[PDB]
Amino acid sequence: MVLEATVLVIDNSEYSRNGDFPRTRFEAQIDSVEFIFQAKRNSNPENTVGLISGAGANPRVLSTFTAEFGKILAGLHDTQIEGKLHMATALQIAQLTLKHRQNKVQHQRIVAFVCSPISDSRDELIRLAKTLKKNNVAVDIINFGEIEQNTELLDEFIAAVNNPQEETSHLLTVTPGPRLLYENIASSPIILEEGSS
Amino acid sequence: MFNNHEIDTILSTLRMEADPSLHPLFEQFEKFYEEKLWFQLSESLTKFFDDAKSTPLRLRLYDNFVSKFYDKINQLSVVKYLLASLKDSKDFDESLKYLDDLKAQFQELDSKDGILLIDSEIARTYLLKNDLVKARDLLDDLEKTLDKKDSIPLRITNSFYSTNSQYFKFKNDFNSFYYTSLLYLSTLEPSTSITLAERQQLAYDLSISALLGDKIYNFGELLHHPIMETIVNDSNYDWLFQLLNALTVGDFDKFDSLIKVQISKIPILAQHESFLRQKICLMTLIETVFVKNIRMLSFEDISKATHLPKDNVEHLVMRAISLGLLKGSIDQVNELVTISWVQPRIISGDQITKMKDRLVEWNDQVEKLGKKMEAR
Amino acid sequence: MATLEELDAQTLPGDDELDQEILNLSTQELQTRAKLLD
Amino acid sequence: HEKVTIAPLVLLSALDHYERTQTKENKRCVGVILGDANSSTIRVTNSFALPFEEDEKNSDVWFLDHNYIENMNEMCKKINAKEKLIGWYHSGPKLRASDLKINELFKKYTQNNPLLLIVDVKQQGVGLPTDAYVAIEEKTFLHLPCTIEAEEAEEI
């Protein structure tokens, strides 16, 4: 399926501090990713992902490019759990990240947790979405927000990224209750179904 | 306010999934205490707002989900309040008793992070007026604790200084303390939202401890920093400010007029002002009057130019590091001080000018020589 | 009653990590162990 | 404090990096610096271009991998044990706060607070085209003065 690089954007933040489903949202985010990546790396081996900090007050990559269990290895340690959005920046790097994605013909993909209230400007958001689309990035977002984070940038954004869907963007805005994220997203063409473009 | 009750519903469902921050017992007890806007500190993001100073009796009900504090609201999260906010329950006891609850023991944050609780619990004992000996010992261990740590919180120091301030606040040594709190201000400087009664009174007590410093003068200080208006203003802050004037003016009865008990409680400022008037006059004399390699200042009229007199010159001037400061010595006969430094200052405005002059001067007259030497 | 099942079934991959992570760590020196020594 | 040796060998290739990378004022060619950092004098043995991306259109936005260093140090180790990470360089000539972030990456990778290195890729003014920094705190970072060693091998 997928031959592309991907990004894991994690907010460990106002929501991931705050467990969305067991054990905590942050933790809940976790195994879903291994779930995600498993499939992603099952989509094809060599489907590569990043992992960054959109969390805390410090943006940065967590897991750099690889396949690869090293991510699962890299994700091994924590984050600021109550931390805050780097997205615009963090995303922006994910672009630069993906720009450097090793052995391109791998398309640029991004997977993004929303544990934050999502502070950004539509313009920047769209310029990103543009820049993504400009860079031709795949972006599928994980959002369980207050409200959720939606009727907002995120909803616009996926669109604002999107001329063709997985060549640009898909979305799933994560649901509350007995919603296992990996169970949640199993449906959404964030994963499975059609996997890349 | 339901803002608790709200969150005592909402953040119970805020991710935080229908939590102990919504329990049949739970929402009642506030409503039981009040809906009336004065409350028990409301369980996460709003208790994270709420210090709420009706003494939390969700004392217990914050202490719910503290089981799940692993997978429930997790941070420091705790002495964020309680051990802070209920540290302000203000008994001996109280905190001692929830020392006796936590004692910085609880599952992971402290007894499996809780160092800042180690700060608190220990520090918090200290703010209870605990015996000096007992304090300092483990305080210095608390210090020793503090020592080898790389702690991203100032809060630790911001505990500890405030703590160790409080320690010296139990004490004199505002030379330390004031400075310690001065330190602590600089320790609070980046962080730590507070209250004014906190702010001024401390910064008062600080500014007090400046005079209960007094010092290596000072003169000028953190006054620049937002302790002022804020503190001064009024009451002794008037004085305290006018003492900054005294830190310049050095007129006894621009102050010894002012004096009420609290200041005259330590009369030695009358001395310290003599120390001031000397030192105050001194610094600029040292700073300015000679510029031309300032030293001599020797002695008497020059020293009485402090408008503190020759026979006190015979002491205050005579005392040097017997002032704590002056270097050099005395030619008594010729009535001449020998002097040297240990006169620093924070000021500006002056040798700025004088600076580059000589520094251009040789520089210029270099080029005369500096013309052909290697050139020719 | 089935939660700790999932929960510790969720730990297992995070558990699996460390050893697996180390199995990565292993080979690394194992060579430089051998390599040099060899 | 620990104020440090400088390896010209570094300095040279460092600009080659800058050169090789065709880094410009828009950019700073960044990389490892090597030595052993214990003593109140630290040594720079060597240093390694970290293939990198820098964006100051958004300050914190920039790209780098550590895993160079990962494989690097291995070989470095295999090359020499004494490589032990002292810190890192960049071009410069000047700092940009994202450095701080970047600085802290190496904190994982270094014994002490690691060592920044500025270079003047144009070597413009004076003694050093260079600054080396260690973070601090109200943050701190600082330049301790540094200089060359022998390296007469160099000197020859």
Side-chain angles (χ1 to χ4, degrees), chain A residues 14-15 17-25 80-82 114 143-148, chain B residues 10-11 13-17 19 44-45 48 68 70-77 80:
Chain A
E14 179 66 7
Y15 315 157
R17 60 168 285 277
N18 177 325
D20 64 357
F21 62 92
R23 57 177 184 181
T24 64
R25 177 169 173 81
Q80 177 178 352
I81 53 180
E82 295 178 353
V114 170
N143 170 28
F144 170 71
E146 185 171 1
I147 312 303
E148 284 172 347
Chain B
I10 281 176
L11 284 179
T13 56
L14 234 199
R15 265 45 189 181
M16 276 167 67
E17 305 177 358
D19 310 339
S44 301
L45 306 168
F48 301 163
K68 194 193 292 181
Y70 289 102
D71 291 346
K72 192 62 192 302
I73 305 106
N74 184 29
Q75 193 58 261
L76 182 67
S77 282
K80 300 296 188 181

Side-chain angles (χ1 to χ4, degrees), chain B residues 78-79 81-87 98 102 117 120-121 124:
Chain B
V78 182
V79 66
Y81 291 99
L82 313 172
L83 304 156
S85 176
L86 280 174
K87 182 171 180 287
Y98 64 74
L102 290 178
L117 177 57
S120 302
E121 299 283 327
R124 175 177 51 73

Side-chain angles (χ1 to χ4, degrees), chain C residues 4-5 9-11 14-16 22 24 26-27 30 34-36:
Chain C
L4 292 172
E5 299 179 352
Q10 293 178 337
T11 64
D15 300 345
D16 298 347
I22 292 166
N24 303 336
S26 64
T27 62
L30 290 176
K35 290 177 175 177
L36 299 174

